[model samples]
Target: WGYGKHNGPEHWHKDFPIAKGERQSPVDIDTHTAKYDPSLKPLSVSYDQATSLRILNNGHAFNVEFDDSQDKAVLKGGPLDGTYRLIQFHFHWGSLDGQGSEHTVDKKKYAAELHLVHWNTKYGDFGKAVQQPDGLAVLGIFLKVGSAKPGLQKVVDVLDSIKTKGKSADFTNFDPRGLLPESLDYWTYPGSLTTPPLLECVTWIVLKEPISVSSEQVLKFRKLNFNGEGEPEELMVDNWRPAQPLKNRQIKASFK
Candidate 1:
């Protein structure tokens, strides 16, 4: 579904009523207003690179799926009450360099945003976890235009193979942590998924430091097709939901 006037975030509320809910995601993180919480532990990310299965173009964005049948890849600490297993990671971007990131910092948007989704093991599976209040934890990383990111080259190189919707390719041994910035400092809040069926069960952990990506690398993402073969090819761009209201939520920072 292309995010046009007819079928965009604006219209998602018709099907997913939770879109208007209080705990929505992609909120503006007012750095000056964010509260510092020293109790928030440093994020414990343990990802088994070998568990990476494949990458797919799911119309919305490219998702690098992981084999989470075991506890080999998981995220602990960092504002989470319990351990959450890594399920998959995806990205959201715009047609141009100036605007693409979902979560903004003081109204300033980045070139792109990456989301590493995880689910609580206590819930058994992601399907069940999404129904619980504290069942999901998503790590958000912002991508800025700067130096070449060699670590992201592995993902960028495979974009061409899965350029169309429903297409996927075998991808293995790629650590999701390689895409993270040097700093573990982040802002934590309770929020929901930024897509349809906007379940309000996510504990968002957004990193303050952004990773670098070249302009050329960022353009490659726009080359993807939102429509599949036999359909009019629509460029996959601006695939990010706008920032919602902060409501009564408080943003907690891991560091001062």
Candidate 2:
């Protein structure tokens, strides 16, 4: 039931054979220009090992949850205050030459995409917090086929733990900060979760710059087994969703 090759992007719904009216995340964006508010304050985020973390097998993608019972960062410097937790994070990818990324810049395509999701500290839980538009902040990073870049090696190094079917790497000693790009500057805007239930309460920070990993590293990422415990071993292939329409949202760059 995998889609690609002759099936291509245009034929995904057919290969997967979903309903004609089924909702799909398509790949296509015609513009990159938008109004952005520079005065918006940066999110003050901190990470720790005690942060409860979990990886879930949501059938199609995986999400990593973080414990934010005690939040140390402030969102806009107000009692927008609540314990921010890391609920889950997943990816969207494509299967062919024109597939494999959600966000594009100046009409450029990348090799892969990564989303590190966080929830509001004000909400008691990720489920409750996700109900509001400002309840989520997603940090999006793009990966494209190119010469080897260094920042992504950290993620590649950990593939050994998440490589097997239904297997999750403990990542106990790992620090989330290690995955961030060197430059703090980012593009921000109001947007919805890239995935469905297509919730719209998200503040997106898509980094302008990208991190690089080797082709070998990407091959390893493709090898992830996700068939859980009983089903046949399934390879984690083509895990990206195509870009979606902007719907007239403004995108702002950082003030610093």
Candidate 3:
């Protein structure tokens, strides 16, 4: 029951009832209506290069898992009441050139989106925190078509090593901060995970600026195999969940 047509976002509610919840994620943000909160603090991100453990293709998407045993890598001070530990980061992309981002802005779509998942340390661990309303915080960054991103090239260079499901490789000492844009401006909202279990426990902070990536780089992501070796090859593309209804939710902007 992954992202295939029969079991995609449209049919997730059958198993995960919370899929239809009011605060679901990947919402289309209308910047014109988004209110700016002058009080929102700047995001505090501290990531230890050594904490980057490895990259894995879990049949859904490739994620760079980090070592969160200590408070060495953490996120704080942006629409958050408490510190959140960095857990892992993943991407959602399209099979085509310009249609893969999970969240859109003013009805504009991008080539891809990157999610840096964090769990509130107040709840002891991610497993326990994920069940609470303010448990998780995901930082979303949009990716557009342009010059090749030098920082992203390191990760892209290893795509061949983990092209199939269950495949993984050491991806240590990488600074994820290099991938972030110069501006910290963002939009904040109460939402759920864009994937199943569809837990309504995430505080989404989506960046206003998008990073650039060459067209060839975007195509490389589609080459990753969704199935494992010896299994029928299913290309991993368009794994993003469509934008959900905002309901009574209000999106807050970090900048005017």
Candidate 4:
């Protein structure tokens, strides 16, 4: 049920039968195996400055939720047939400096990772769209310890308010597109979500280039609690799930 010794990623499959599903997530993307698709179109991203609503500590990672009542912010192109609306964004990090990323390239793990979750507008709603294979598209961005990112600093400053699990604060007027790295070049694959339900419905678009943050900023994420306002305290760290097998899937790249 949690990321303890007995209930972590290794034990996730016990409760979620879908955990063993063919299209699981966070795959180790070997660059040599991924073919370059010259036909892949450039990713088109547009965002409205007012969509960010609040930030919540979902006991896993802190999620910056957006108002998805409309597709004011959306993603198009790059393996998508239509516009996918952005609903939320969250991060996965490690306890120390060595390992944390979910999807590793050439078995190289970054300090952390970010997920910007979007659901297909063709499916009507986020909840209903989650069931279909083409319902969601998650943009994965890797984080390495280097320079500090001003975009990330906004959320880090408010982390104290949501340090306890299930706690949230009014976080608005934040534009997530500003957080993306310069390069949209990515590895594309069909996979599941990295968390509960672990639905095999996500089309993962993992950017090849990483956005950097200083060690202090990355460490600040560890301050959030996993145990909430009661019982013993468990800090949220090493929150990324292990990479799943690609099985029959082929990971394609947008650039050579």
RMSD of each: 1.0, 5.2, 1.0, 1.0
| TM-score for candidate 2, residues paired by index | 0.72
Model 1 lDDT tens row, 25-47: 88999999998999888888887
lDDT for 86 in candidate 2 is 55
lDDT of each: 0.91, 0.57, 0.91, 0.90
| Decoy 3 TM-score against native | 0.97
Model 1 CA lDDT for position 53: 89
Task: Kindly indicate the candidate among 2 and 4 with the higher lDDT.
Answer: 4
Residue 132 CA displacement from its true place in model 1, Å: 0.7
Give the lDDT of residue 123 in candidate 2.
65
Instruction: Show how many residue pairs clash in every candidate, following the order shown.
Output: 0, 19, 0, 0
Ranking by lDDT: 1, 3, 4, 2
Runs of candidate 2 with Cα error greater than 4 angstroms are 1-32, 48-58, 72-84, 93-99, 145-165, 229-234
Better of 2 and 4 by TM-score: 4
lDDT for 108 (candidate 4): 91
